[PDB]
PDB file of C-alpha atoms and ligand atoms in Angstrom:
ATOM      1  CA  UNK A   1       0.000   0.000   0.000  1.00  0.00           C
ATOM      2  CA  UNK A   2       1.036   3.247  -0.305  1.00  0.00           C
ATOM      3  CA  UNK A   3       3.210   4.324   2.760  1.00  0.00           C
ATOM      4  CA  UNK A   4       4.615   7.022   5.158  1.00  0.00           C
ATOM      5  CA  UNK A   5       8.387   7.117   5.699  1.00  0.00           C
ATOM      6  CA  UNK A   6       9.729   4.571   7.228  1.00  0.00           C
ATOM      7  CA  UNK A   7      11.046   0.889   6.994  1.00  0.00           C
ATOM      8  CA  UNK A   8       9.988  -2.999   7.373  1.00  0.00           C
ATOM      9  CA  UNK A   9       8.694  -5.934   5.891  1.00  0.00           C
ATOM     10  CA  UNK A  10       6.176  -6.556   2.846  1.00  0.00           C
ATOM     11  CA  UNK A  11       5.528  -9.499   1.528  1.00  0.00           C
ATOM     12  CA  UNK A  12       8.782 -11.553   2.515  1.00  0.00           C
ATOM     13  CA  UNK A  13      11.017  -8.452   1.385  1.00  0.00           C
ATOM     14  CA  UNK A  14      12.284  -5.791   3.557  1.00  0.00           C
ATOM     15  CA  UNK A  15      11.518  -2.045   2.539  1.00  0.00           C
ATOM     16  CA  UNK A  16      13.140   1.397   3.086  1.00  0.00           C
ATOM     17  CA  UNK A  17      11.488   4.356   2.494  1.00  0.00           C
ATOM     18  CA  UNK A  18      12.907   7.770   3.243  1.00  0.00           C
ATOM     19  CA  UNK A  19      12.609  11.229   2.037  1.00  0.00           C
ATOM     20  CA  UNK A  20      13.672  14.365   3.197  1.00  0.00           C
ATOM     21  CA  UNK A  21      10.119  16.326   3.844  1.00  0.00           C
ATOM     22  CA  UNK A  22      10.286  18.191   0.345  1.00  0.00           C
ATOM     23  CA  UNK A  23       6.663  16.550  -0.735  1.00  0.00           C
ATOM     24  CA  UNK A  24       5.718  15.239  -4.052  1.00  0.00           C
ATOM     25  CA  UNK A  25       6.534  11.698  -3.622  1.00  0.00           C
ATOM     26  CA  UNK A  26       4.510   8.595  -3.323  1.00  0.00           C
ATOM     27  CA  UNK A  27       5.518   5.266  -2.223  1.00  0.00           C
ATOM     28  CA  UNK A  28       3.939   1.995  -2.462  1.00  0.00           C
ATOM     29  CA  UNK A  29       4.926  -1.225  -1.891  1.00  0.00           C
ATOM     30  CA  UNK A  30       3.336  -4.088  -3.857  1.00  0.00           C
ATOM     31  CA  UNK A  31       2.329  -7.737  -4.438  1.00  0.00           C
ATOM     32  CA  UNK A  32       5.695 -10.182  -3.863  1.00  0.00           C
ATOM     33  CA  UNK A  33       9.027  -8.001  -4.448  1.00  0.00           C
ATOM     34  CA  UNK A  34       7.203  -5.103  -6.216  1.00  0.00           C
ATOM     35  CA  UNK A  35       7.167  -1.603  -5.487  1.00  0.00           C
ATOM     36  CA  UNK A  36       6.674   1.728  -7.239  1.00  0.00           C
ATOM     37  CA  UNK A  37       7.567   5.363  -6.581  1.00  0.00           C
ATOM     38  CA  UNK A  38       5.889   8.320  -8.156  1.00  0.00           C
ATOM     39  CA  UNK A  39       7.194  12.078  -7.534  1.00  0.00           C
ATOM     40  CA  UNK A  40       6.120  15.638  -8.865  1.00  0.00           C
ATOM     41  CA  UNK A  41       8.349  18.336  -8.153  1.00  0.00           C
ATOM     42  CA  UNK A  42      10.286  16.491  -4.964  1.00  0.00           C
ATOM     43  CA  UNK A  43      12.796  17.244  -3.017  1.00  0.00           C
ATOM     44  CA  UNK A  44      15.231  14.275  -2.283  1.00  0.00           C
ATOM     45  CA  UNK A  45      13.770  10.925  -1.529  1.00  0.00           C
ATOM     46  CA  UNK A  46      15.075   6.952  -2.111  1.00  0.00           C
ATOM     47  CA  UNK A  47      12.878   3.900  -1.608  1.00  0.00           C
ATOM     48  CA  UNK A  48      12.977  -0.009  -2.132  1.00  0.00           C
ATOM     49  CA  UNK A  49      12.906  -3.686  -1.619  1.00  0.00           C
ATOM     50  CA  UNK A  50      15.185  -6.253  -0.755  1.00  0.00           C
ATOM     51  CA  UNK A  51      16.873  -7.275   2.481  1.00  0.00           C
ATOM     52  CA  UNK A  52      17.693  -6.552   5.884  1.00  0.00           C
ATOM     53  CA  UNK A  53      20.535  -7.692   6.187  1.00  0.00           C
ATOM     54  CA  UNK A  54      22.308  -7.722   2.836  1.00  0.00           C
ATOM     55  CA  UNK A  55      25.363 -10.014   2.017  1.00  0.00           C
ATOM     56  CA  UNK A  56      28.438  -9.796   0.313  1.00  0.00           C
ATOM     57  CA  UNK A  57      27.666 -12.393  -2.066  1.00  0.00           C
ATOM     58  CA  UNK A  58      23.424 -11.739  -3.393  1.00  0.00           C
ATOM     59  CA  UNK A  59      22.452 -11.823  -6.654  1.00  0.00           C
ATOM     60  CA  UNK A  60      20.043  -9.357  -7.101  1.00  0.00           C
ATOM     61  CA  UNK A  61      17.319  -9.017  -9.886  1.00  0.00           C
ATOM     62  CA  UNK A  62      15.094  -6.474 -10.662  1.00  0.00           C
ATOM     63  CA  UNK A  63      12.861  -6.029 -13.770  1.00  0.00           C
ATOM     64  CA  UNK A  64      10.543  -2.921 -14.192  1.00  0.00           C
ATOM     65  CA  UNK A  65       9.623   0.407 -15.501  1.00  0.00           C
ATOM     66  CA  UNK A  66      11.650   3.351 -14.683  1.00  0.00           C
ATOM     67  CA  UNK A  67      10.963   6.596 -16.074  1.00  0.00           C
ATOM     68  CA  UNK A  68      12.794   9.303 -14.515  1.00  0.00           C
ATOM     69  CA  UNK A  69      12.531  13.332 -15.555  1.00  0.00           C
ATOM     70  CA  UNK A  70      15.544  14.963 -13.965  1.00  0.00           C
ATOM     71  CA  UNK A  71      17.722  13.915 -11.487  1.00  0.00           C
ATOM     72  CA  UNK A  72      17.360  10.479 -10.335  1.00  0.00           C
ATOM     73  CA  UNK A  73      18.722   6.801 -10.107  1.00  0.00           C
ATOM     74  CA  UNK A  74      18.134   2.909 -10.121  1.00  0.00           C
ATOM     75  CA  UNK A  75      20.874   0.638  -7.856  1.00  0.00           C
ATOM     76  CA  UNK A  76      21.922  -1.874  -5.799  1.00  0.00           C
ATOM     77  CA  UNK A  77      22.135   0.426  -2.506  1.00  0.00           C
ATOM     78  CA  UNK A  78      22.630  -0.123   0.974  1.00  0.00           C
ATOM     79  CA  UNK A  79      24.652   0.320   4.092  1.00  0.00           C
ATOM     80  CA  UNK A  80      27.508  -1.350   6.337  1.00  0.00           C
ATOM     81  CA  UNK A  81      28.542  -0.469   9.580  1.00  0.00           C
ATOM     82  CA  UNK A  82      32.092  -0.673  10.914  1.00  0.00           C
ATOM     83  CA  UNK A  83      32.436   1.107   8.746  1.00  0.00           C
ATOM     84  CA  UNK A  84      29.770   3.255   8.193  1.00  0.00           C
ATOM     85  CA  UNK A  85      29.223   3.052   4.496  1.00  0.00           C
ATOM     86  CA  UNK A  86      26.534   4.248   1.628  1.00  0.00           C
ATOM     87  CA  UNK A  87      26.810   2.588  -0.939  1.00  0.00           C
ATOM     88  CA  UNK A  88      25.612   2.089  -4.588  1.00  0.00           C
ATOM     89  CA  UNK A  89      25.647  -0.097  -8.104  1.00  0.00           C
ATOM     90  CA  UNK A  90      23.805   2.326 -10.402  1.00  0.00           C
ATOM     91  CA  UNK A  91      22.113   0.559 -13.091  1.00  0.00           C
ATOM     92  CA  UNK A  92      20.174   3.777 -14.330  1.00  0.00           C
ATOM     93  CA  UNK A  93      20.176   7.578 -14.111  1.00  0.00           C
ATOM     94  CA  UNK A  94      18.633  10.599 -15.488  1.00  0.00           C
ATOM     95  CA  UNK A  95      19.901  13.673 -15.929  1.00  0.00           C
ATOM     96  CA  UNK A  96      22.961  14.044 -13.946  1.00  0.00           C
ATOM     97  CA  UNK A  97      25.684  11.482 -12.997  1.00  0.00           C
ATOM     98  CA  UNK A  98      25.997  10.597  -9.534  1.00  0.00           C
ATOM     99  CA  UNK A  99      30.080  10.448  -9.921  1.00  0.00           C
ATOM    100  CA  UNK A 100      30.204  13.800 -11.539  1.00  0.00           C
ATOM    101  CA  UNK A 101      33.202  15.537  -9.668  1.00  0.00           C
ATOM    102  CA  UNK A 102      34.622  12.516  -7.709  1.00  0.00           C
ATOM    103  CA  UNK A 103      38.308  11.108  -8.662  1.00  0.00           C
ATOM    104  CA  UNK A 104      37.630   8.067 -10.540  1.00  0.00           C
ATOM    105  CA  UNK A 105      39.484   4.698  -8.703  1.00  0.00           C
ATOM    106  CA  UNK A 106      38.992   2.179 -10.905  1.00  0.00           C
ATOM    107  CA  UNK A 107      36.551  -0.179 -13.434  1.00  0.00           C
ATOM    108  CA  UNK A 108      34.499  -3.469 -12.862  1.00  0.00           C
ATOM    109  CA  UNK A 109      33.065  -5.235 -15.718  1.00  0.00           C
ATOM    110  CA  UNK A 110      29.899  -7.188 -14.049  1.00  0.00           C
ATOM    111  CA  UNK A 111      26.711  -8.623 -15.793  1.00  0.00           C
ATOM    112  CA  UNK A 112      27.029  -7.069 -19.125  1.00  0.00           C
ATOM    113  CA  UNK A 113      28.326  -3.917 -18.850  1.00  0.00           C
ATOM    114  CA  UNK A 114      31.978  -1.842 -17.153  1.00  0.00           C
ATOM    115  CA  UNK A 115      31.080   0.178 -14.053  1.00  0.00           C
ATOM    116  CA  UNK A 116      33.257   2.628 -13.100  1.00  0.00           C
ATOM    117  CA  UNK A 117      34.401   3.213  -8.926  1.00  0.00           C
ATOM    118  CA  UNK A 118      34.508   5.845  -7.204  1.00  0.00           C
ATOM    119  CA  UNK A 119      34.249   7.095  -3.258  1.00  0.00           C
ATOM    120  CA  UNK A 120      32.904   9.980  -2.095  1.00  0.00           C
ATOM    121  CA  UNK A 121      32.109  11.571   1.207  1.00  0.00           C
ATOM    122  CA  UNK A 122      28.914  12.820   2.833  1.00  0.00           C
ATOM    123  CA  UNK A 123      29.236  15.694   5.623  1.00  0.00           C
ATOM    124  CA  UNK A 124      26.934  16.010   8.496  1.00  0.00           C
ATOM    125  CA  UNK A 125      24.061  14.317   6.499  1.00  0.00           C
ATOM    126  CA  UNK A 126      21.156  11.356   7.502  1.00  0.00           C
ATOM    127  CA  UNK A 127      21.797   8.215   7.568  1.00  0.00           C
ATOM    128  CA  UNK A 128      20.613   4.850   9.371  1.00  0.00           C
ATOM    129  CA  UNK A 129      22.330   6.403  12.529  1.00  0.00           C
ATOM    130  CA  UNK A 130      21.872   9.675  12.439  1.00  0.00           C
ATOM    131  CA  UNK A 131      23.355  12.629  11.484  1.00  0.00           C
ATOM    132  CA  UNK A 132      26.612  11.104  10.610  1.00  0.00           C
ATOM    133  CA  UNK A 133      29.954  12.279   8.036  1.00  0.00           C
ATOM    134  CA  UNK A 134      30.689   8.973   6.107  1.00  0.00           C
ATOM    135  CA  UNK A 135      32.379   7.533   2.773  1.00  0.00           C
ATOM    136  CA  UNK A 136      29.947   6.780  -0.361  1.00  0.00           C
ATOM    137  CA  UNK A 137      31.419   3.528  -2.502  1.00  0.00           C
ATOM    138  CA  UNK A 138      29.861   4.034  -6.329  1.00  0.00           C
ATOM    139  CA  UNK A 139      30.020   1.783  -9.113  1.00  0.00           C
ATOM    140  CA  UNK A 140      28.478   3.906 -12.247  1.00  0.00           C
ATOM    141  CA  UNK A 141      27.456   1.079 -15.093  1.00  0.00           C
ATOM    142  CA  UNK A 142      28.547   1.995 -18.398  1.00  0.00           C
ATOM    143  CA  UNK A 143      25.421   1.476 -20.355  1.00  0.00           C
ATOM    144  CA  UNK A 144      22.227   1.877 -18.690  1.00  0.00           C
ATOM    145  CA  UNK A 145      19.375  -0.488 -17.917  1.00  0.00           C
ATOM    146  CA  UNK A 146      15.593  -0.921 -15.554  1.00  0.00           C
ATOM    147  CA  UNK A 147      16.050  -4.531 -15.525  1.00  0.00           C
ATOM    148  CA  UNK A 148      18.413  -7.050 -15.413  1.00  0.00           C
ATOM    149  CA  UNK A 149      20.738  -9.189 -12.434  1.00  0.00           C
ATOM    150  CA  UNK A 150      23.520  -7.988 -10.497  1.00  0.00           C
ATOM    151  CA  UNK A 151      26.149 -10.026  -8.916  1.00  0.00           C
ATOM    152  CA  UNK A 152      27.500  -7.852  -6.039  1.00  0.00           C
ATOM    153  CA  UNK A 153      30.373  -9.511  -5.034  1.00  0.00           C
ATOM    154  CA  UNK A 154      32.162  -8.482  -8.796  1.00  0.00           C
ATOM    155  CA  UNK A 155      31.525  -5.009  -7.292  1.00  0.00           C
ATOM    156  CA  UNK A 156      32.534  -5.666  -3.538  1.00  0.00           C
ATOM    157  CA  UNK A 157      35.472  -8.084  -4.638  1.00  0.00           C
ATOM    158  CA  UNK A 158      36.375  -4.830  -7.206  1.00  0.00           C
ATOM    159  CA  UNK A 159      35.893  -2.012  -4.360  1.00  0.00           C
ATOM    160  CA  UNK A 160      38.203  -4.014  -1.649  1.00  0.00           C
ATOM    161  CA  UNK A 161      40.357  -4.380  -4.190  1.00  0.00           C
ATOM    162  CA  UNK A 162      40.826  -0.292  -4.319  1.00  0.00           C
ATOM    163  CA  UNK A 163      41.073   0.018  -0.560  1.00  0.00           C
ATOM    164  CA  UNK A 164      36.803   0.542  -0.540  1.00  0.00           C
ATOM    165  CA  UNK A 165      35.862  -1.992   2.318  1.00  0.00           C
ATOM    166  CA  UNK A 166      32.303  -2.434   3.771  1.00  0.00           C
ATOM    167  CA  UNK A 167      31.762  -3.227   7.503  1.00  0.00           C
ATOM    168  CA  UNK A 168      29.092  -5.461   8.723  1.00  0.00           C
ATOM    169  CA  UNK A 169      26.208  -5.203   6.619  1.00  0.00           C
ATOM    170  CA  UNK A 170      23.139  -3.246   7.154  1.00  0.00           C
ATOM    171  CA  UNK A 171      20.275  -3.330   4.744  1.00  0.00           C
ATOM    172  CA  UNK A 172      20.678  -4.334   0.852  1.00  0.00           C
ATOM    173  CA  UNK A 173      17.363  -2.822  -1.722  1.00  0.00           C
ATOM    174  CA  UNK A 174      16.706  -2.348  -4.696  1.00  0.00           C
ATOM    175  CA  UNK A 175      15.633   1.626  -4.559  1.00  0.00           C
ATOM    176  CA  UNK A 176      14.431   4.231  -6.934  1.00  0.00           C
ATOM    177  CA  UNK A 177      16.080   7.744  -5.630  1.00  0.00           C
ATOM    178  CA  UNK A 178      15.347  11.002  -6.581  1.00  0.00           C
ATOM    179  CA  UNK A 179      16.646  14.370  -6.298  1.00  0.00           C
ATOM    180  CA  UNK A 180      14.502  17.673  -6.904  1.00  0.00           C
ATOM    181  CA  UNK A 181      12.871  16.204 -10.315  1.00  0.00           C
ATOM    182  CA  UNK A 182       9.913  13.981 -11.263  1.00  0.00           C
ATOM    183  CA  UNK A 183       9.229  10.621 -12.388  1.00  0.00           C
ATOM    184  CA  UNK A 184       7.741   7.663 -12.515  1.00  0.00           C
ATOM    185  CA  UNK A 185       8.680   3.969 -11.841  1.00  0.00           C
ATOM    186  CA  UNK A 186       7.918   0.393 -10.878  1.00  0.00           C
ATOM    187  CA  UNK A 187      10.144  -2.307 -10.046  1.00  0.00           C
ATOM    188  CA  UNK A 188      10.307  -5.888  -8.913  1.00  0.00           C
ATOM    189  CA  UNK A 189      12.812  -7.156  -6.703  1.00  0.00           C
ATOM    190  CA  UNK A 190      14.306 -10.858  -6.389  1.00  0.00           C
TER     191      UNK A 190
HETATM  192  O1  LIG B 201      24.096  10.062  -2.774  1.00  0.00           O
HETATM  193  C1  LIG B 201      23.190  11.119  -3.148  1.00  0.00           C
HETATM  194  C2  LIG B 201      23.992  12.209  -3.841  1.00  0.00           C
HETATM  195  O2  LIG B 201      24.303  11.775  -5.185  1.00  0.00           O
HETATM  196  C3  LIG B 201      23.148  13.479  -3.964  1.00  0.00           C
HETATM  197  O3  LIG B 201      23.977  14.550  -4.439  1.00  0.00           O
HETATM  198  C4  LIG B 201      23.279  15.528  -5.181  1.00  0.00           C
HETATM  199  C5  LIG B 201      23.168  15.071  -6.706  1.00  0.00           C
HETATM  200  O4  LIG B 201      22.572  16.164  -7.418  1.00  0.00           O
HETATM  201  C6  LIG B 201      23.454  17.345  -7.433  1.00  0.00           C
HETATM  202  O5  LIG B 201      22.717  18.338  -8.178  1.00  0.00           O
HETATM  203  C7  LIG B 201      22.854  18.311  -9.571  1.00  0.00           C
HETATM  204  C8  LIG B 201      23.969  19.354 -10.055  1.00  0.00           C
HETATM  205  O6  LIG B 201      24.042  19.230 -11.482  1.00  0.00           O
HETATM  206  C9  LIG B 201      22.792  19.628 -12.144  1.00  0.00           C
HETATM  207  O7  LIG B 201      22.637  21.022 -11.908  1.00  0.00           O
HETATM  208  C10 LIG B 201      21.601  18.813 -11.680  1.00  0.00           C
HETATM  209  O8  LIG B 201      20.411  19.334 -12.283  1.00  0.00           O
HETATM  210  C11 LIG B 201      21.471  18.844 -10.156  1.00  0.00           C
HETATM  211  O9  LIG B 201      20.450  17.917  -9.751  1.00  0.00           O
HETATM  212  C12 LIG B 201      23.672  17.870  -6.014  1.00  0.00           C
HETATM  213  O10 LIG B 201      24.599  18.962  -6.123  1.00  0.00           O
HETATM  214  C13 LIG B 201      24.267  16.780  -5.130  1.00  0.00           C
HETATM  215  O11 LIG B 201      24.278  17.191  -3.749  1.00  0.00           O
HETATM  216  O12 LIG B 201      22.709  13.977  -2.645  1.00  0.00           O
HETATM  217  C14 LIG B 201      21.788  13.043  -2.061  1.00  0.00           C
HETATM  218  C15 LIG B 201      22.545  11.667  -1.808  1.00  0.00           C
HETATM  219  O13 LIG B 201      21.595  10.680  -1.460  1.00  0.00           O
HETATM  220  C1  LIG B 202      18.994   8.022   4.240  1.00  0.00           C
HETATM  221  O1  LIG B 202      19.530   8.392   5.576  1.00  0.00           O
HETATM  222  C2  LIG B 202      18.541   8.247   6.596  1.00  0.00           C
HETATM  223  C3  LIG B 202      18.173   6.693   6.691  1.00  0.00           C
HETATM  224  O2  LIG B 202      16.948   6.583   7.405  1.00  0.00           O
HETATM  225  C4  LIG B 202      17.050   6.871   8.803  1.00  0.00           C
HETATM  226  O3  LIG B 202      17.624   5.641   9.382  1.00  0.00           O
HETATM  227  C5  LIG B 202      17.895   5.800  10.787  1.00  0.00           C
HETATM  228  C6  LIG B 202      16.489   6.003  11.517  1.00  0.00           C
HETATM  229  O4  LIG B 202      16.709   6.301  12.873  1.00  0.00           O
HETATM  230  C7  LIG B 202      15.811   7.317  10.916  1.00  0.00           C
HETATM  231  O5  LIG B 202      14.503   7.444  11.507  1.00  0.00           O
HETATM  232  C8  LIG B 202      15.667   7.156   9.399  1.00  0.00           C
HETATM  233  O6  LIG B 202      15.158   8.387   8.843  1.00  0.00           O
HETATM  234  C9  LIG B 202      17.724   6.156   5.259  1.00  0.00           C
HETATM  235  O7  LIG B 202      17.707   4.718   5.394  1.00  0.00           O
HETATM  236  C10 LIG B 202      18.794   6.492   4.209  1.00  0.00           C
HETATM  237  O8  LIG B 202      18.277   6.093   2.924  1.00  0.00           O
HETATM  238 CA1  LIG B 203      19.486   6.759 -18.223  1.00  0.00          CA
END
């Protein structure tokens, strides 16, 4: 159904949904591993399915419809702690690239496509504890996609590899995020 922020568990799948107040998002969760988000004008949100917690070794699908306008993206995403870590496998983005402006560390070829690695750093920002400063680990896929399977452990294996290494981890979706733009999308998790 559609839902306030927040997290849990819908029909055998974990969900996160979080935005930042701006309005103009709607979240739903769906039938099996399915969930949709549709925005208007929002401010920065990200919401999906999968697990809580992830591992280093899933392979994820995910099939679906996404139709961003503006600033958005589609990826593997989730947190460790010990370290404290954000991280992402974009599959899909809209208008701007997430790595635009961070000092590229290396490449992954994984499921089809290269992916290129980078960290960044968030300041003094949310996160699942708190206001917290912490690293970002980002591998950007080459060619774009809504649906397809992604191994994470090429892109784990890849990051350690580089010095990027996760801590214990936290939760592991499938999410749709979106910054100050509209959109539409629906996606299936597995
Ligand atoms: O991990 C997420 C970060 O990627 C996100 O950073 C914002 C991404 O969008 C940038 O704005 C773009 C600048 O280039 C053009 O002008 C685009 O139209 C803008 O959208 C912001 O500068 C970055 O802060 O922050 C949220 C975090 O979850
Ligand atoms: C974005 O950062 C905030 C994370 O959600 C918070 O997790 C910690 C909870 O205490 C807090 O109530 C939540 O808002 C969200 O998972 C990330 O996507
Ligand atoms: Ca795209």
């Amino acid at each position: 159904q559609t839902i306030q922020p927040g997290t849990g568990y819908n029909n055998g799948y974990f969900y996160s949904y979080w935005n930042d107040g701006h309005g103009g998002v709607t979240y739903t969760n769906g039938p099996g591993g399915q969930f949709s988000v549709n925005w208007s004008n929002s401010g920065n949100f990200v919401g999906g399915k999968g697990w809580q917690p992830g591992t280093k070794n899933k392979v994820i699908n995910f099939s679906g419809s996404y139709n961003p306008n503006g600033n958005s993206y589609l990826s593997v995403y989730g947190w460790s702690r010990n370290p404290l870590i954000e991280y992402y496998i974009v599959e899909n983005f809209g208008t701007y690239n997430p790595s635009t402006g961070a000092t590229k560390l290396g490449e992954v070829t994984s499921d089809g496509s290269v992916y290129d690695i980078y960290r960044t750093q968030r300041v003094n920002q949310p996160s699942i504890i708190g206001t917290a400063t912490f690293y970002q680990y980002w591998s950007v896929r080459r060619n774009h996609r809504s649906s397809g399977s992604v191994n994470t452990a090429n892109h784990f294996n890849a990051w350690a590899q580089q010095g990027l290494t996760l801590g214990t981890m936290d939760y592991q979706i499938v999410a749709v995020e979106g910054y100050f733009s509209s959109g539409s999308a629906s996606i299936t998790v597995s």
